[PDB]
DNA sequence: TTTTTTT
């Protein structure tokens, strides 16, 4: 039926939600289900044409009070179910995009829709703007892990080369260890260049 | 439920953080020019912890704002609502909620509302069997520890009352079962957030 | 002695309570987890205990058979203490151990090796059915009617003769209901062929397992057993004994997608050139034979299986016939999730006992030389591969593949027969040996996944195209025979082609591809 | 003992809690009295819901599960006492009083962990009530037991009786009875066994293989013997699925005895079945509402046409053959004359058509439509096998495929492909309605036949008998002969393509589009 | 004690000869298995000479042995044409 | 295969390992050879094959191709 | 989203450890931060600076546990062992739990986390051997776990009371207990007319 | 059970048997016959989202839902025997949510009690499994196969919490 | 042992 396509889209949304919950690190999100979404939209257009025909039949007056009322109610319920399924899937994908923007953009374009990519860019701009102004003193993009360790030994996961610090330039030559405060090396760890001393 | 925003306390904490950062910068300039950086490291760690706590609280508040954007627009539209939206939120929080709701409405409208019939095009309408507006679950269970009366005197609090074995307690009721129970002071309990909200506004119990 | 045995049990309990793998006691935690899973047994690593507590290992090696029951009693006591609140008995807990030491050859095992722990490896010839060993009993003395309990440990006791409340010669008689039993399984383990001396058959030894150790393995599986070599005298040379190995533990040498794992199958389905990529990856060394590769892919996919309400069922497998095809069949045997590759020798027949066609279920079944073989003649094969069934009947629901060089061709969904640069490249690869691309396992898993996930049906457009093409072919043949069996074969091929894309319904493009492939028939 | 008395009182309380159980015991007693007067006597066996015993006392139900020997015997004694009180027991025979038949107890439904399979059976299940389901195998031939060796000392005037008990028969362990008739009475007069007064209950112990589908690959299904007594004996036969509510019982020394030096053998385990339930996995069930609907259907102007159209509705173009199949399903009337002449109650139909004409598909649909049917393929069917079957076993006779379902119809694919000698053996079934080998097996079964033209394509110029491989005598033996073959017409081809597309478009209720299954 | 090692230049000549032998088998078969047998027979000739490295003459005699096998198969049918076509191919040297 | 208990005896082709095996009268033995040539296993023969087969069980005739003179596989001849 | 899905319902063990660090603890200084009447200063905005600035060598003082551990990383600080964190006190709590299976011993809500952190760092400061304290802590944890199992067997939709239960135990039990009680309450509400 | 909850949407999309109380021409699409009018007493399984509304409204309600086999007394008896042994997932992945919806549409105290007892037993088993942590098992695999998707999500959350706690305890 | 007959 018309709601079966929306049910399939919601099933894909639940599958992606379970996958993202299973993997702590953010995987490249599944490609947007444009085919199922377009099928649901075509079904919605067909239901709208059917509702227009039912309204024309009501203008004709034949069983307009009861039969046409029930038919229009059923068609409207189908449209509402399809819209709810599409909204749920889009909201889940957009929440995944917001989580990704908080994870990386604060410090897989083919998978996203073009509107979704524009929305993710707008979300990154909003995050940068929220940090840019009031409450700029604390890096809102900074890690939410509590500062358990003031100092921690750090060495390069990758040979990125010279790196900036509060008052120093540190070479990231391969397998080069350091002893520095965790706060200064938090950004470098977010870059992935240095891991666990 | 989102707690009302304490503007005075938040602003005082922010001003203290700014002054502490300025003093730390001045000490850094003096050191670059006794000489013990251990107190400076202590102040830096304290500022980092305070900023982390403030950012976590603000992020949770923004999460609640986005979760109940529809209900917050409804409350702002509803003059009968006891709390003004600006009263509940900060100024930046109100601007963020308004702009985010507008952007989401524009996206959803251009996506589906153009094809949707105008009678069903309303995004926040309650006409659907499940209301599209999303509000905090008042009845949701939440752990709590009875803080006791904010005043030192137990007798001074009318809610505080002697219970069996000489234990002060606060009577509470769960509307669904219409059951009444007494919560001993300094004790932990699990209760619906709606009944707990009275004692929470009274500050008699702090959520775990 | 008995005080020393109680001290041994207490020392085992003390070591369990006070041994911590990393400041956390694994023995206490593992016992609690086993209790939570209701596992009335405990597994202990000899490495962890004997890494620095050598005295316990020394006593155990001195008297393993008698020592083990004391350890099990200590395990029961520790479990009762940890799990049962005091002031508010448990079934016996089996002790599992792993020697974690050098193995000894089964032939190298000797009479001195008996009565001592042994680590080894081999292939189990068979596993005997479980046999309940009476862990406890209540023996009623007949002449005086009073009972006396008996408990037995399955290591290395008989009913007492005296009545003891002595009115009878052997008056004691078991109470079966009061008696408590534990299942025990016998195992026969052949030595590994490398352990066997050259020119000699592997030696086999009788072994026993009980409680959780039973059914831990299956017959024919190579495994490494940890068990004490022992001796017993069967009721059936002089002073000769029947060797056996009581097992302390077993480690098998033989030994559903995650969030990242399922996404790979999703991408493989997302590829639009997936069918051609599978055809190309099949027989990559072979140049040309595109129709053969496409037919192999379509056979691996198989036609959609369905059952009508009246009881009529559509055939769920495609059938392919060929007339370097042996290399293609060798590749098909690996690529198929279930396959049996043979020249028809099986002396077992292809359709029969259980034949290769019956043993293969779904996937594809390949015969290296179908026409050459004449045993299990085509009369039975016709029914088997046409109705997927064979006064004996056997299921034959598996895709048919026949390599070679009528009625069988009529049953077959398709038929077929059988570059210097390709020869040069193959010679270069073979010389380097002597002096799109997708993994075979990944492709097999993807084929099984597509078969399990989607069984495409014909869309209305595909059905109309198939009907028009069939009518046109019938008219052309009448002008010049094609049958509805071949039409059903073409429909199955279209469904198989759509199965790769996992489309809800087949398409007119699939119908065109199926008709083009059938043109080669 | 005292706990057994408490269990008897508690089971009597359970019978009081569920008046239907006491009413059923009294109904068996009253039916036995009425049937003894009329002549057919119901056995003194009672089956109750396990959930019903749980409702009376969850403790009692779980206690019966944990210690069936301790609880079920006292519960059956309470049921027997209730039955003895309720029964009029008029004019009881001396042999009946000696029999003193116990009222058996069985638990039905809601078995849970007590529900079991032979592979999943455990030593903990021993000495505990359980329900085991599996394919029956190696069922023992019925052998009479002995409740008591009733005797009578000569000239004493008193009938001394010696009871005998078996550990498999009694859930509780017991010291073995001598099972030997006394040579002399306790009084000292010579003792003679009293046949008739001695009670003999039929005893059968049938192994139950685990279901082959349930059997793990690379492993043989486990089998556990289930004890059967009285009506439970011969309740099922090997190769037939059955579920038995029976207490697994540890038994034997299991190597504990001194004689077993190796001690490798485990304690013998034999389930003692309280009841045996044959399971289809069939036969249609008729109710009053469906009977009124059937009366209305017969009142319909074309009842036979309605039934035929209902038969094989998806099949296209075989509606006349389906009407003939409905006539064959009725079979006609069977009559046995006072002269002994036999009129068959079965009708044989034959239809010839090219491969993929779906005539064999209609025959398979008829095999499905019949509650019982015999399936064979002419290339794989032997008429000697259809008339009779031989097993090496002395050799044991086996019923032929036509002899099997001797009342039911037999559908045969490729009947023309079946040999003419096979057709002669089938003609013995078709006309004589009986087969003679020197063993004789009745073969009155209807023979619906799916066949193909000898050329493989029917020819109008060729006679229908010429196209059919069957002889003219065989065609006469068949009640009806049809020629339904594949053909190519434009409109009919569009219709058949739409029918196949409609079969594909049919959606199972549980599986949506794009989801595999399972007027 | 000796393990023959195929010579690279002789093996290049033998690979060209194997392509020519497959073409000649099509003309009047020859297989990559036969070329591998040529490599093995070159190892055998090196063994006959007890040389750890296979000689170019060893590879040539091995190609000759494989060509003799091909000629022996369908001898009367194809042997004369095979000999005429393989007078140069049978021995690289 | 024989009773020991049950025990197995190694085959002749298996007994000839790494040393050149011998074959003659080139058809079950031909199946062991040919299954060995395609399989690389007779159980692996692990041995070279040397054939001494009379042609068609009679004196050699020039007209018969070797495939006719001794039944075998074309892949076996190539191998 | 801003809040991780696991963090939506319960605090992480690291967050509970952060709270325990926010708690204070006594320690023995080894630096005369107090200056004689005859210098860098903490000037902490969230905690007292006077105690740190007045610390003198081997003069017992209390400070927030995080700062106490930070100083203990240096040799200057030696944390003072909690009195309840003594072998006799642990034995008393174990005996109390044994005599009162229903009533948990009055351990601090952060008893488990504090004992684990002290074993990680303050093991040297313990006059009693650390192994005995670890064994006593494990025994108390096992007793409390058995009591928690009994309480879960005796769950009720209306409410529950856990007086002396550890804060870490409460955090671990929050998801399962909350979900089960919410499901039971939903079932009861659906049953209600 | 949110409006955007995909699990709730699927549970609502599940069909349940029903018997028509009205004859409505033009509703043959539900009947799956293009032009056949609906008839009274007609029995047809309908999606829960539509079937529940039809049962609620109609005065005589437009349709009356027939009792599903998942709500059958035989399944109830199997649950009363052994809540854990039953395959609630095989019966329905959203079996508990469907039972709650059926209780809301028709208040059944005994059904709620049986469902609560089954949920409690299965939750005890799931808690044991989640407490069992690595230092896939066949027993846990079969238990999960019996467990519905919602119960499996709850078990995954609890087991992940326990595993994270154990890892943080055993690692610095 | 000797038919009987299935492999």
Numbering used by the authors:
A (entry chain A): 1 to 107, 119 to 208
B (entry chain D): 75 to 107, 120 to 294
C (entry chain 5): 20 to 107, 131 to 198, 205 to 213, 235 to 305, 320 to 338, 348 to 415, 421 to 443, 446 to 451, ...
D (entry chain 3): 18 to 56, 90 to 331, 338 to 449, 454 to 497, 503 to 583, 648
E (entry chain 2): 773 to 800, 804 to 868
F (entry chain 2): 580 to 583, 588 to 609, 614 to 629, 640 to 676
G (entry chain B): 1 to 38, 47 to 201
H (entry chain C): 1 to 58, 68 to 144, 158 to 194
Quote the study that presented this structure, word for word.
The replisome that replicates the eukaryotic genome consists of at least three engines: the Cdc45-MCM-GINS (CMG) helicase that separates duplex DNA at the replication fork and two DNA polymerases, one on each strand, that replicate the unwound DNA. Here, we determined a series of cryo-electron microscopy structures of a yeast replisome comprising CMG, leading-strand polymerase Polε and three accessory factors on a forked DNA. In these structures, Polε engages or disengages with the motor domains of the CMG by occupying two alternative positions, which closely correlate with the rotational movement of the single-stranded DNA around the MCM pore. During this process, the polymerase remains stably coupled to the helicase using Psf1 as a hinge.
To test this hypothesis, we performed a rigorous 3D classification focused on the C tier of the MCM ring of all replisome particles. This analysis identified six conformational states of the replisome, referred to as States I-VI, which vary in both Polε stability (Conformers I-IV) and the location of leading-strand DNA lining the MCM pore. In State IV (1.2% of the total particles, 7.29 Å), the leading strand DNA is completely released from Mcm2 and translocated onto Mcm4 to engage with Mcm5/3/7/4 subunits. Coincidentally, Polε is further destabilized in this state. Therefore, in Conformer IV, Dpb2-NTD becomes the only part connecting Polε to CMG. Notably, minor conformational changes in the Polε binding sites can also be observed from Conformer II (State III) to Conformer III (State IV), gradually leading to a floppy Polε.
